[PDB]
Amino acid sequence: QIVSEMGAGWNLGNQLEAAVNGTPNETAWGNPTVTPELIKKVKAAGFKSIRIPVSYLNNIGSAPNYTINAAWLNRIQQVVDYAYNEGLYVIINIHGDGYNSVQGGWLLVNGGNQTAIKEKYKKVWQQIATKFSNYNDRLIFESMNEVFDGNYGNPNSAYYTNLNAYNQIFVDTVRQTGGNNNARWLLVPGWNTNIDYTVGNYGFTLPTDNYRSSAIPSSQKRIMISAHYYSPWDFAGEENGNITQWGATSTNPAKKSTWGQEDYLESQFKSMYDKFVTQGYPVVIGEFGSIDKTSYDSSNNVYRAAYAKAVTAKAKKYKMVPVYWDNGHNGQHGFALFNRSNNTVTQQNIINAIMQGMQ
Ligand SMILES: OC[C@H]1O[C@@H](O[C@H]2[C@@H](OC[C@H]3O[C@@H](O[C@H]4[C@H](O)[C@@H](O)[C@H](O)O[C@@H]4CO)[C@H](O)[C@@H](O)[C@@H]3O[C@@H]3O[C@H](CO[C@H]4OC[C@@H](O)[C@H](O)[C@H]4O)[C@@H](O[C@@H]4O[C@H](CO)[C@@H](O)[C@H](O)[C@H]4O)[C@H](O)[C@H]3O)OC[C@@H](O)[C@@H]2O)[C@H](O)[C@@H](O)[C@H]1O
Numbered sequence: 001q002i003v004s005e006m007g008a009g010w011n012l013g014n015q016l017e018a019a020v021n022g023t024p025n026e027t028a029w030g031n032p033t034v035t036p037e038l039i040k041k042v043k044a045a046g047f048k049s050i051r052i053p054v055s056y057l058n059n060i061g062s063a064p065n066y067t068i069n070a071a072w073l074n075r076i077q078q079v080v081d082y083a084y085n086e087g088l089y090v091i092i093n094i095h096g097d098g099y100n101s102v103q104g105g106w107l108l109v110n111g112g113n114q115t116a117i118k119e120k121y122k123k124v125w126q127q128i129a130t131k132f133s134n135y136n137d138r139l140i141f142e143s144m145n146e147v148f149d150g151n152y153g154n155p156n157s158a159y160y161t162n163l164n165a166y167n168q169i170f171v172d173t174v175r176q177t178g179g180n181n182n183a184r185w186l187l188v189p190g191w192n193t194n195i196d197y198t199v200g201n202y203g204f205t206l207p208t209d210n211y212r213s214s215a216i217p218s219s220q221k222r223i224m225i226s227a228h229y230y231s232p233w234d235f236a237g238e239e240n241g242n243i244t245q246w247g248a249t250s251t252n253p254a255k256k257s258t259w260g261q262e263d264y265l266e267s268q269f270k271s272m273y274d275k276f277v278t279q280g281y282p283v284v285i286g287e288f289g290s291i292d293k294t295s296y297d298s299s300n301n302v303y304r305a306a307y308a309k310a311v312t313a314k315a316k317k318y319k320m321v322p323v324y325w326d327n328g329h330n331g332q333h334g335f336a337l338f339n340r341s342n343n344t345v346t347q348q349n350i351i352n353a354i355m356q357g358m359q
Contacts, residue, residue, distance in 0.1 A: 001319065002185065002224075002282050006089045007048030008312060008358045009323030011287060012039075013335070016079060017053035017095035017145075022104030024055045024072065024096070031328040031340050036082040041343055046355045049089035051286055051323050052079060053145065055096030056124060057104035063116075066123040073131050084138060091187060091286070091323075092132075093142035094124070100150040109162040110149040121166055122173050129177040140185045142226060142286070143170035148192035155191045160203030163191060167207045171223065175211035182212055187284055189226035198227055199271040206281070221280045227272060228287040228325075229311060232260030236289070236307065239333045241296025246303045247310060255297060265314055273318040283320035285311070292334040305353035312357025324354060 018029035027033055039050060054076055061067035076092070083090045096102040100110070111117050125143075132139055147163050149156060167188040174181050188207060190198030198204050209223060230236045234243040235257040245256045272283050288311045293300040308324070315322035330336040330346050337347040345351065 003319050003321055005048070006284075006321045008046065008354050009049040009051055009089075009091075009284075009286075009321055010042050010045075010047040010337075011051045011053065011323060011325050011327075012079070013053060013325055013327040014329070015053070016076060017055040019055045019057050019096050019102065019104065022058040024057055024059050026075075029327075034079050034082065037343050038338070038340055039082040039086060039088070041338060041345075043086050043088060045337075045345065045351050046358070047088075047324075049091065049321065049323065050083040051091040051142075052076075052083070052093075053095035054092055055102070056094060057096055057102070057106075060120070060124060063120070064123075066120050066127075068124065068127050073127070077131060080132070080135075080139070084135065087138070089138050089140065091140040091142050091284070092128070093145050093187075094121075095145040098144045098147040107144060107147065107166065108149075109147060109159040109166075110156075111162075114162055114165070117162075118165060118169055122169050125170055125173045126177065129174045129181050133177055133179075133181050135184075136180055137184055139180075140187050140224070141170075141174055142187040142189075143167050144189065146193050146228065147189065148194075152192075155197050155202050157203050160191055164203070164205045164207075171207045171209055172211045175209065183222060185222055185224055185282075187224045187226050187286070189286075193226055193228040193286065195227045195229070195268050195272055198225070199275045224282040224284050225272070225276045226284050226286050229268070229285055230288065230290075230325075231264065231268070232257045234258060235260070235303070237291055239291065241293060244293045244297035244300045244303065246290070247306045249306055250303060262310060265310055269314045269318045269320065272320060277319050283318075285315050285320055285322045287325040288322060289325040289335050292330075292332060292336075295332045301347070301349055304347075305349045308350050309353035309357045312354050316358055322354075322357070 014029040015026045059069045059072040098107040099105045190204040235246045250256045312322045327335045
């Protein structure tokens, strides 16, 4: 399967998506410039795929051409090479651009100018796809990252239609730049990469792949579905010491998460299997992880490893690819498993839990 070959994934987080004042800058969010030795270390840890968040933002020139700074494409291509030349699977996306909350963000489903958004998106993907056209199947394009209106409840149907439109433009645009783009795996999310809003009857539609092999048609899918998983937020993302433990081995009610335990995890990943995996769409859990709370509770890393084990093992069970969110921050509320400055492992137990989960 594509899924077994991809094994477990690691995110090169807070690098090529990092941006200040709208301008992408891989050193702007506390990490050093990426070097090939980092990617060699991650591979050595057991990871077989790397996900590479990339932001474009002000590196995109004006209309009507929306030309991407040559030096930026050349940088992205160097970083992708670090992974690709190591025999890994590599995912590149459009990351910061899709966020209302990121300065310079423009790929907004709540935008009034959709015809303008879609034209910029098409032209941007055209250039990225042209740049990467000779790379093989180990290079995956991910259409966008977490795309929504900034609101956490029920998705607006008209807005979901916009998101669906971007997925479709992405697919057809990439296919039309031709081999190896005509054949390569393309990864697409639903609403806010949220499982419930992606599997439920909220508006998600699968993109057609009509421009692929148009003269010798179809019909085997070269599309994957994205979702991210950080539930329960109280344990995995809330930046305070209220909730520091998780799962069946925790027996401390004052500190244990109040939802999203093992039962919930099962039913969530079960729904992605039922809706997509069984239909021939691989599924990539493109981000998962829990923030460092050892500054509040000296037992927290036990539960960070337990959480990562459970998440990885459940994905393995349902034939989806688990990809760890590492933002390089070793510290309070950090996600890092490596020190990128000294190229050393900082969370061996969590890496161990991932590899155990992948068995
Ligand atoms: O214009 C950018 C804009 O971003 C706004 O927030 C949006 C932005 O969040 C960035 C964060 O992403 C997290 O990963 C997420 C991932 O992208 C998603 O795909 C995933 O699904 O969710 C993930 C989890 O949330 C990532 O983990 C965060 O780390 C990142 O936050 C940024 O962190 C950096 C680095 O800070 C840390 O390391 C260095 C330490 O010094 C620091 O104390 C640590 O916390 C921040 O960079 C720092 O910026 C400060 C102040 O500006 C500078 O002084 C300093 O030089 C620099 O290191 C950065 O500010 C912070 O945002 O994208 C995702 C979207 O959800 C968010 O809404 C912010 O609200 C804006 O202020 C602005 O930064």
